[PDB]
């Protein structure tokens, strides 16, 4: 599926010696339009909790944010765009799209540029195209 | 700028232990949007015969296609919309975008799938974008 191919062959895939952990493309309901293999189940709150911090930026900031209950300290990100999170040498990218959100989660630190940057330029691309 | 930077951290990026030799964004003038290091000149009527290939498919396959005066045997493309060529154990991948070529030069056979296809999602990306 087209969905599928999107996490398959563009967010898993190793650019500059890395690669996410785990990556998905979901609604604004959080329901999974398609995800990576080791991708964890979100909470029903942690998905609002993400939406509210697009429509009000600095509402996960104070708290943290949850995913599958493990704590993401809120970094910079670009706001009612990207939300970004750190956890250990890890971290997690959210961009949003008109109707869905692009999903990715990394173990480790990332090479300095856009080449690894597959959450925000799919996010892009599905924008661009009125998605 | 916006076009140097798709070049160098999109179409030069390595992935999959892969990257281009060379990569260019040029307009159907064959005038240079961007382009990498290595990037050939193309020749006025090189660039008159790729267009010529996308407006009738099949024009440049029985002479072969010529860069910067070097022959590459066309192989399948997506018709109007990318043209192919092979040289040695490397090839050459041109994506037309309403208003762009999208070019990318390898030295190496690719790994296969759509994550090396870097020359095809750009052009896709700049085509939902109305360029």
């Not at 493309?25 to 189940?41: C, E, M, N, Y």
Request: aromatic share 8%; with cysteine.
């Amino acid at each position: 599926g087209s969905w599928q191919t999107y996490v398959d062959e563009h967010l898993m895939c190793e650019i500059e010696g890395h690669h996410l952990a785990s990556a998905a493309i979901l609604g604004h309901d959080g329901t999974v339009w398609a995800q990576s293999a080791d991708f964890p189940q979100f909470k029903p709150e942690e998905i609002t909790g993400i939406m509210k911090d697009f429509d009000e930026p600095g509402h996960l900031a104070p708290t943290g944010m949850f995913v599958a209950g493990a704590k993401y300290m809120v970094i910079q990100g670009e706001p009612g765009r990207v939300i970004r999170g750190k956890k250990g040498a890890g971290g997690i990218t959210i961009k949003k799209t008109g109707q869905a959100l692009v999903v990715g989660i990394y173990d480790e630190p990332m090479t300095p540029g856009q080449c690894n940057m597959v959450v925000e330029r799919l996010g892009d691309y599905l924008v661009e195209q009125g998605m």
